RNA sequence: GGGUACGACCAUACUUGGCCGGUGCACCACAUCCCGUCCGAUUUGUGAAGUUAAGCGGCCACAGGCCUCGUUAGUACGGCGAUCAGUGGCGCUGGAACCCGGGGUGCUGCAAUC
RNA sequence: GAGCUCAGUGGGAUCUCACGUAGAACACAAGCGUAAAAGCUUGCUUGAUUAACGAUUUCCAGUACGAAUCGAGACUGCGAAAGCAAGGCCAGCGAUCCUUUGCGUAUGAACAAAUCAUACCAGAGGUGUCAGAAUAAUUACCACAGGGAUAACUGGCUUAUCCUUCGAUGUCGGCUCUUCCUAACCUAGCGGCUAAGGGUUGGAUUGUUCACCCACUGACAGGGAACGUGAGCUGGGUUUAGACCGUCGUGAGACAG
RNA sequence: AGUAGCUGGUUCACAUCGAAGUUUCCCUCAGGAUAGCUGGUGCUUGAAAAAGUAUUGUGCGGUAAAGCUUUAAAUGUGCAACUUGCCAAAGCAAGGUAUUAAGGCACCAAGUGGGCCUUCUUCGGUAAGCGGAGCAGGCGAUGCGGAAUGAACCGCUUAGGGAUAUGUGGC
């Protein structure tokens, strides 16, 4: 699904309270960092002689996933972000 | 303007619609009897449960025998055998309804108090017709028993009272 | 044969007044529609029609019996006010609508009829918008934007009221043909009403 | 041989005797059972049935709530009409939130030591059902009252909490255990 | 095995034969004060605000008028109880009731057998 | 298995309870708001005149 | 009584083909400008020479359709009943449609108007 | 928003005119609906945003998820305007934990700032077994708790069901012995019909039944009796463990071979 | 004393009421949880918000029949008996000065969650004492009387007894 590379979506910022063209960037999930509260648990829990200690999800059924779109008005840094429908090939242009 | 409806089949295996109409007729047992006046709305209730009832148009004599012999007032929820006219004036606080003759006129002439009267009577508990029925399964004109049998109910209902 | 007996069976006659061709109903059903929350308080409609000889402006509100025509201002009555000629031109529509707007206030936050173009195309400067601009200028709070006034440039989003004023005053027909003063005189003579 | 359909469902469950082991309730039921039967008064019929209730269903009343309900009753009384006795079939409890109360004449099964002293500090009598019967054998200007029971913490638990309309209180030793994010919660309100 | 919101509405939301088309002005000019009785007869030509299906033909009182919609309280028998439903509805789907028109006529107005001398009389035999 | 047998029987045991009376849970709430808000302004004024009315009746009753 | 505008119901007002004919309606003239098309055909603006041919409206169809009532028909089907018969009658009851035929072939509202 | 009318038919030359109730189109199955349109072109557009935790419908337990409806606030979009629009009606999707991203302060509790982490809050990553463990075979060497809720088997019904039986009703066959039936093979009487009386062989192959053969015979009929008959037998068939072969299997092992 | 959603057992009487084999959910299908059914406890007051029923009025419907995928039953089904927005504005809006029958509400809790048959209607299956549903009634849980016999047919449903008279069925 082709998506515009820019959109005048509405802006919650006080500086705005208005429609503004938003620089669209696709949301790609950030790196899974080591010292996340719950990675430290999983690591502590994987220390020792129980093998795997938590389930590892294996069987995906979804082929697609929701395409979060981070946005940001020219005016300021704040990144409004909004979901779309599932697509096998999001690609803004 | 008045039918003496009589439940004629027993209380087993009866459907929810017939089963309600019989309760509203106060025909909860077998040979119970009530006088119900023949409104269209009643004629459509009676038409709904005719296999469960025999009925017709009571003679003044049929009315006397039921009210005098089988007549029972509801009193404080008690089923009270009629025995005094004192008993009747107390039940019916009604300058119109004092005699047991007041009652027989109401449940025969069709009354302005036909409900005020017949409701204060416990539904009649008749004995099974002496000499038997014919077939509680067929309609009267089929050579059976149930359903409207016009003025003939007086005979049938006479053997019972 | 397309129109056999089976055709007239399954055929559903459209509404008489659409079948007659005299009314748009997607518009009639929106022009007439108002919030139900409004228990049914009046919603007047400035229906305006250009019968080929003469203009018709008609303040109106819908009713189930058939809509009431509260007030009307036919161009026929212009000559009663000194406009003896051009009784269907843009210069006249302004005074027709300004007339109904002024004959309607004569009974009576501003009164707010909304324009009912009917089927007329809303090209810029169409005579129908002259009835509005006349009536709107005459008192009624007809909602509108200058986009279809004559003298309103598409490119450059702004009206040329020095031009819009001209066609209102009948200068419009001057170049295709002293009248300009008989309309200003025409207008005082309809406020004299 | 009778339709009985819907007859049993109409049977009512009522107490006909007190479960109270207390001797005095039984002398007190002995009175108002009598007095309720031998008088035409509807007051004796209420004091007699309430007297048969559970201590659950005989909720205590605040002396605060008598002083309120009483003056609110008595303020309208035409001059020269002394105020009604404030009978309750239950305990009467002192209220710290109302330091000064009117010379009430309350009549109840039981009084807190605090209620009884505040009641007499105002000069009001703190009489029992014994002399209630001896002064108002009939409920003559008695003002029969009940203590509250909706604010009772047992009923805060009624229903489910998880069911959307509900504001039932979940059962929990741990207040923080079933605490929940605003997102995940049942809808608070819901039309019946 | 497949009960979506409009299961089995092939006939229910059909327009009557030669009576197709969006609701007219008589519809649009009907107005609903709260507590008015109404009939939730869904009209297919209007799709926004259409009543579920159970609510088709049900009567109920308006409890609510929004600008294009009429809130209606409609009893539903769920089991041993009639739950009292609150369908939201576009006003096209609400036909105002005459369910009380007789009774309103009443408080408007609140404000045997004999000889039959007939002579024609054919025999009834076969 | 999905038979619905004995269900309307089992349902009419305690009757079909009839629906709540209109005078009870007559909450607005999700009512079209602008009307709902003006209703508060009136109801609040009914309260000030209800209380103001009772204050009148007492002062009147001191006579 | 009719004409116009805006209508409500939306065929009894629809389709066809006839004939019939004061306000207006229309067609009609030109397009300079507002405005729009391959084309002023449509649309738009400006008119008032022409005509009612059409549109329009009204009257006619052994017209079709639609509406209406009857016939169909107490038929079909149906609810209840029977220690009914061997699908059907029956008893108590509710009761059509297609069809064919008689009739019918719009009606009402506001506004200014002959 | 505006303009427009379509599928198809027919008259002429992609076009043109006529008729043209939707017979087309409307992503996607189907229904629904739809004609100056909801279809088609066209223009401008981002209402497919935000949406104070508004209420509701569907599922329903009147829980959720999803989906949808009526709303309000914002800011818009289109439109002369009323109005219409918070996606493309309706299927298209998902908890807790965790990760992650955003957003506007809060916590890291002796104190303080920075870092880090956490929290609130709003999305996202997914559980398709879709109210959501993270999961390969085999067992004839097998085992236990049960089940006639459930096969084979056993009678019944029918022409497969799952009614009885799984704290067990001994399988095919034969042999042995009796018995009953007849849509009668022989015999008997008739002229195909009656006729159940008595009889209906011995062998080769194969467990067989069955079939086919050889011979006899007046003939070598068909069946029932829990597919008569295992506390009567026999144990050839079926036949557990042993083993061999073929095929299958990576293998253990499977095969009604 | 492993565990057992499985099997088996679980000891006085009487009285009062008395089911369910269905809903949603569950690695759930021999089990739970959930709701319904049931009991107990009340509470609340007494034609309150009564009704497996009609009548009347007003909606809804598209099955049988009809018809050649369209008109249209019957049985059904719903329902009824001064202050502060809008309007141009003070007027509109909103809140305020037949039969029968005890109604509603709460709490706690069990069993149940294999059903079966039949009536009528069907669906699947060549058919079945067959699988599946709808309706209602039954058996389950219930005798008694009757059909010679029969879980569910017929009649009737039931405290301990007597008279009377019947029901289905007979003589
Ligand atoms: Mg007999
Ligand atoms: Mg029977
Ligand atoms: Mg338009
Ligand atoms: Mg409290
Ligand atoms: Mg329909
Ligand atoms: Mg089950
Ligand atoms: Mg359009
Ligand atoms: Mg909320
Ligand atoms: Mg949701
Ligand atoms: Mg969707
Ligand atoms: Mg699941
Ligand atoms: Mg079995
Ligand atoms: Mg054998
Ligand atoms: Mg043996
Ligand atoms: Mg009992
Ligand atoms: Mg078991
Ligand atoms: Mg059909
Ligand atoms: Mg058929
Ligand atoms: Mg017997
Ligand atoms: Zn911004």
The answer for B77, left when phi > 0, alpha when psi is -120 to 50, beta otherwise, is left
Contact D139, D42 (CB under 8 A): yes
F1 alpha carbon, closest ligand: 6
Q: Give the chain F residue nearest D192 (alpha carbons).
A: F25
Query: Å from A16 (CA) to G68 (C1')?
Result: 69
Q: How far apart are CA B115 and CA B118, in angstroms?
A: 5
Among F4, F17, F33, F38, the strongest candidate for a mutation testing the E interface, having the largest count of E CBs within 10 A, is F17
How far lies A30's CA from each of A43, A57, A68, E4, F51, in Å?
19, 20, 13, 38, 62
**Residues belonging to chain C with any Cβ–Cβ distance to chain E shorter than 8 Å:** 10-12, 15, 25, 28-29, 32-33, 35-40, 62-64
What string of DSSP letters covers C86-117? -TTSHHHHHHHHHHHHHHHGGG------EEE-
Q: How far apart are CA D85 and CA D139, in angstroms?
A: 9
DSSP class of residue B127?
Answer: P
Token readout for C84 is 């003896």
Residue-level length of chain F: 63
Among D1, D2, D3, D11, the strongest candidate for a mutation testing the B interface, having the largest count of B CBs within 10 A, is D3
How far lies B100's CA from each of A8, C113, E108, in Å?
93, 78, 41
Residue among D9, D191, D192 minimizing CB distance to F14: D9
**Residues belonging to chain F with any Cβ–Cβ distance to chain B shorter than 8 Å:** 8-9, 12
C37 in reach of chain F (CB within 8 A): yes
Query: Å from F59 (CA) to H242 (C1')?
Result: 116
Whether residue E11 is annotated as binding a ligand: the answer is yes
Residues of B in contact with F8 (CB under 8 A): 16
Å from CA of B132 to ligand 19 middle? 21
List the nucleotides on chain H closer than 7 A to a protein CB: 2-3, 8-9, 19-22, 31-38, 45-59, 61-64, 66-76, 79-85, 87-104, 116-129, 133-135
Q: How far apart are CA D10 and CA D14, in angstroms?
A: 12
Q: For tokens 């909490």, what's the residue?
A: D161
**Residues belonging to chain F with any Cβ–Cβ distance to chain C shorter than 8 Å:** 32, 34-35
Q: How far apart are CA D145 and CA D163, in angstroms?
A: 35
Nearest CA-CA partner of B4 in B41, B58, B40: B58
The answer for D37, left when phi > 0, alpha when psi is -120 to 50, beta otherwise, is alpha
The closest nt to B140, taking CA to C1', is G91
- Who contacts E78 (Cβ-Cβ below 8 Å, separation ≥6)? none
Q: How far apart are CA A10 and CA F4, in angstroms?
A: 53
Q: How far apart are CA C78 and CA B45, in angstroms?
A: 75
Å from CA of C45 to ligand 7 middle? 21
Contact between D189 and F29 using a beta-carbon 8 Å cutoff? yes
Å from CA of D147 to ligand 4 middle? 12
Contact E91, E40 (CB under 8 A): no
Q: How far apart are CA A25 and CA B53, in angstroms?
A: 83
Pairing between strand A2-3 and A91-92?
parallel
Q: How far apart are CA D2 and CA C182, in angstroms?
A: 101
Query: Å from B92 (CA) to H184 (C1')?
Result: 94
- Hey, which residues does B18 pair with through a beta bridge? none
How far lies B11's CA from each of B16, B30, B32, B46, D162, in Å?
12, 7, 11, 16, 46
Instruction: State how far residue C31 is from chain F, nearest Cα, in angstroms.
Output: 23
Q: How far apart are CA D104 and CA D121, in angstroms?
A: 10
Residue-level length of chain E: 126
DSSP class of residue B116?
Answer: H
SS3 B160: helix
Contact C97, C135 (CB under 8 A): yes
Q: How far apart are CA B106 and CA B36, in angstroms?
A: 11
Q: How far apart are CA B152 and CA D41, in angstroms?
A: 55
How far lies C3's CA from each of C7, C8, C11, E19, E64, in Å?
5, 7, 9, 20, 48
Give the number of other CB atoms < 10 A from CB of residue F62.
7
Residue pairs between chains D and E whose CB atoms are closer than 8 Å:
3
Residue-level length of chain D: 192
- Hey, which residues does E119 pair with through a beta bridge? none
Q: How far is CA B109 from the centre of its chain?
A: 15
Contact C59, C141 (CB under 8 A): no
Å from CA of C94 to ligand 13 middle? 114
Query: DSSP strand E in chain B: where?
Result: 3-7, 32-36, 53-55, 72-75, 78-81, 124-125, 147-148
Q: How far apart are CA D105 and CA D103, in angstroms?
A: 7
Helix axes D42-50, D23-38, angle to 10 degrees: 160
Token readout for D135 is 């002064």
Question: Residue E80 — φ and ψ, nearest 5°?
Answer: -85, 5
Q: Resolution, in Å, please?
A: 2.5
Residue-level length of chain A: 93
- Hey, which residues does B125 pair with through a beta bridge? B32
Give the number of other CB atoms < 10 A from CB of residue B40.
7
Token readout for D192 is 């019946």
Token readout for D85 is 């006795």
Give the number of other CB atoms < 10 A from CB of residue A39.
12
Query: Å from F47 (CA) to I79 (C1')?
Result: 36
Q: Give the chain B residue nearest F12 (alpha carbons).
A: B16
| Strand I lies under 7 A from the Cβ of residue F38 | yes
The answer to whether A and B touch (≥3 CB pairs < 8 Å) is no
Q: Enumerate neighbours of C (3 or more CB pairs within 8 A).
A: E, F
Query: Å from E26 (CA) to G9 (C1')?
Result: 9
Q: Enumerate neighbours of A (3 or more CB pairs within 8 A).
A: none
- Who contacts C44 (Cβ-Cβ below 8 Å, separation ≥6)? C59, C60, C61, C70, C111, C112, C113, C114
Q: Give the chain D residue nearest B7 (alpha carbons).
A: D2
Task: Taking the CA atoms of B48, B49, B51 and B53 in sequence, report the sign of the dihedral they define.
Answer: negative
Q: How far apart are CA B86 and CA B100, in angstroms?
A: 10
Using alpha carbons only, give the angle C38, C40, C43 rounded to the nearest 5 degrees. Answer: 95
Q: How far apart are CA D151 and CA D130, in angstroms?
A: 30
DSSP count for chain A of H helices, then E strands: 1, 7
Q: How far apart are CA E34 and CA E40, in angstroms?
A: 15
Contact between E65 and C28 using a beta-carbon 8 Å cutoff? no
DSSP class of residue B132?
Answer: -
SS3 F56: helix
Token readout for D58 is 């005989």
The answer for E49, left when phi > 0, alpha when psi is -120 to 50, beta otherwise, is left
Give the number of other CB atoms < 10 A from CB of residue E39.
20
Contact C137, C144 (CB under 8 A): no
Q: Give the chain D residue nearest F22 (alpha carbons).
A: D192
Q: How far apart are CA D118 and CA D114, in angstroms?
A: 6
The closest nt to C6, taking CA to C1', is G65
Whether residue A11 is annotated as binding a ligand: the answer is yes
The answer for B76, left when phi > 0, alpha when psi is -120 to 50, beta otherwise, is left
What string of DSSP letters covers E11-27? TTSPPPTT--S---HHH
Helix axes C161-168, C90-104, angle to 10 degrees: 90
Token readout for B134 is 């014919």
Helix axes D113-121, D63-74, angle to 10 degrees: 40
Contact C170, C137 (CB under 8 A): no
Token readout for E99 is 């369910």
Give the number of other CB atoms < 10 A from CB of residue C56.
19
């Amino acid at each position: 699904v082709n998506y515009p590379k820019k959109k005048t979506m509405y802006c919650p910022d006080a500086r705005c309270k208005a429609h503004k063209s938003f620089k669209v960037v696709q949301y790609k999930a950030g790196k899974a960092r080591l010292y996340a509260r719950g990675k430290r648990r999983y690591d502590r829990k994987q220390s020792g002689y129980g093998g795997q200690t938590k389930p590892i999800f294996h069987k995906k059924a979804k082929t697609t996933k929701k395409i979060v779109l981070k946005l940001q008005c020219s005016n300021c840094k704040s990144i409004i972000q909004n979901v779309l429908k599932r697509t096998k090939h999001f690609e803004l242009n | 303007k008045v039918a003496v409806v009589t439940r004629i089949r027993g209380i087993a295996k009866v459907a929810p619609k017939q089963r309600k109409i019989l309760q509203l007729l106060r025909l909860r047992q077998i040979f119970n009897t009530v006088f119900v006046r023949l409104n269209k709305p009643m004629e459509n209730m009676l038409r709904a449960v005719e296999p469960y009832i025999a009925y017709g148009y009571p003679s003044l004599r049929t009315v006397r025998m039921m009210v005098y012999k089988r007549g029972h007032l509801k009193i404080n929820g008690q089923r009270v055998k009629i025995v005094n006219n004192q008993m009747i004036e107390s039940k019916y606080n009604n300058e119109n309804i004092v005699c047991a003759e007041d009652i027989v006129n109401q449940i025969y002439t069709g009354g302005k108090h036909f409900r005020e009267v017949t409701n204060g009577l416990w539904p009649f508990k008749l004995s099974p017709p002496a000499g038997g029925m014919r077939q509680k399964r067929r309609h009267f004109v089929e050579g059976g028993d149930y359903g409207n049998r016009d003025a003939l109910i007086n005979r049938f209902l006479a053997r019972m009272i | 044969v397309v129109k056999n007996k089976a055709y007239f069976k399954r055929f559903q006659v459209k509404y008489r007044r659409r079948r007659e061709g005299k009314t748009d109903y997607q518009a009639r059903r929106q022009m007439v529609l108002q919030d139900k929350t409004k228990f049914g308080t009046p919603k007047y409609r400035l229906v305006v029609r250009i019968t080929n000889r003469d203009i018709i402006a008609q303040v109106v509100q819908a009713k189930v019996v058939g809509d009431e025509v509260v007030m009307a201002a036919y161009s026929h009555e212009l000559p009663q006010f000194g406009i003896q000629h051009g009784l269907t031109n843009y210069a006249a529509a302004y005074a027709t609508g300004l007339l109904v707007a002024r004959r309607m206030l004569t009974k009576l936050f501003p009164f707010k009829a909304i324009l009912d173009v009917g089927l007329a195309r809303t090209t810029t400067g169409a005579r129908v918008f002259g009835v509005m601009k006349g009536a709107v200028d005459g008192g009624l709070a007809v909602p509108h934007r200058p986009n279809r006034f004559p003298g309103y440039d598409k490119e450059k989003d702004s009206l040329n009221a020095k031009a819009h004023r001209d066609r209102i005053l009948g200068l419009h027909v001057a170049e295709y043909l002293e009248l300009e003063g008989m309309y200003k005189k025409a207008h005082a003579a309809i406020r004299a009403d | 041989g009778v339709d009985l359909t819907g007859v049993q469902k109409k049977k009512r469950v009522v107490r006909h005797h007190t479960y109270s082991t207390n001797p005095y309730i039984k002398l007190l039921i002995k009175l108002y059972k009598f007095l309720a039967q031998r008088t035409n008064s509807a007051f004796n019929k209420l004091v007699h049935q309430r007297l048969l209730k559970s201590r659950s269903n005989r909720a205590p009343i605040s002396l605060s709530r008598i002083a309120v309900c009483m003056k609110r009753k008595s303020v309208w009384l035409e001059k020269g009409k002394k105020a009604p006795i404030a009978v309750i079939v239950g305990d009467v409890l002192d209220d710290v939130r109302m330091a000064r109360i009117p010379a009430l004449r309350v009549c109840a099964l039981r009084f807190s030591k605090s209620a009884r002293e505040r009641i007499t500090g105002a000069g009001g009598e703190c009489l029992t059902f014994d002399q209630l019967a001896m002064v108002a054998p009939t409920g003559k200007n008695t003002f029969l009252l009940r203590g509250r029971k909706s604010g009772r913490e047992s009923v805060k638990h009624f229903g489910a909490a998880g069911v959307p309309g509900s504001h039932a209180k979940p059962f929990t030793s741990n207040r923080g255990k079933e605490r929940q994010r605003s997102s995940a919660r049942r809808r608070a309100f819901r039309h019946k | 095995h497949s009960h979506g919101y409009k299961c089995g509405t092939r006939h229910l939301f059909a327009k009557k034969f030669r009576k197709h088309g969006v609701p007219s002005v008589s519809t649009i000019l009907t107005n609903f004060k709260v507590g008015d009785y109404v009939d939730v007869v869904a009209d297919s030509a209007v799709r926004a605000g259409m009543p579920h299906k159970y609510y088709h033909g049900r009567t109920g009182i308006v409890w609510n008028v929004t600008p294009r919609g009429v809130g209606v309280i409609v009893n539903k028998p769920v089991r041993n109880r009639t739950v009292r439903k609150r369908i939201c509805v576009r006003f096209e789907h609400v036909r105002k009731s005459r369910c009380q028109e007789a009774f309103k006529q009443k408080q408007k107005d609140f404000l045997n057998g004999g000889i039959v001398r007939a002579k024609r009389v054919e025999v009834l035999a076969r | 298995n999905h038979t619905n047998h004995n269900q309307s029987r089992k349902n009419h045991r305690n009757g079909i309870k009839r629906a709540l009376p209109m005078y009870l849970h007559n909450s607005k709430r999700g009512s079209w708001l602008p009307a709902l808000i003006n209703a508060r302004r009136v109801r609040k004024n009914n309260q000030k005149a209800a209380v103001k009315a009772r204050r009148e009746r007492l002062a009147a009753h001191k006579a």
